[PDB]
């Protein structure tokens, strides 16, 4: 509860130097896919289809 009044003010007499962390992702892993290897791995009939 803030002690509000029409003629009262609160003024700081000191200060705190505070250091905080913010962590942000920037990049993800780059991937490549060989379709023939994934679907028809070393099968000539599957590769031809």
């Amino acid at each position: 509860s803030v002690a509000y009044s029409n003629n009262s003010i609160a003024i700081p007499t000191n200060f705190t130097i505070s250091v905080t962390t913010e962590i942000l992702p920037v990049s993800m892993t780059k991937t490549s896919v060989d379709c023939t290897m994934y679907i028809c791995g070393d099968s000539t009939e599957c590769s031809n289809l």
């Binding site: 490549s32 060989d34 023939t36 290897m37």
Partner: protein, 49 residues
């Protein structure tokens, strides 16, 4: 101009091998398909091969 992903490095087979068990005898084709008597269908005979 640039760098392009190609297919993964393929190695072709050099020879074909076949590995079957040490089996000598022929299956009893004469006993199965040339039996003198055959069972009735209600009492059908089962033979292990």
């Amino acid at each position: 101009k640039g760098i392009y992903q190609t297919s993964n490095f393929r190695v072709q087979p050099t020879e074909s091998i076949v590995r079957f068990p040490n089996i000598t005898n022929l299956c009893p084709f004469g006993e199965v398909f040339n039996a003198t008597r055959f069972a009735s269908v209600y009492a059908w005979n089962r033979k292990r091969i």
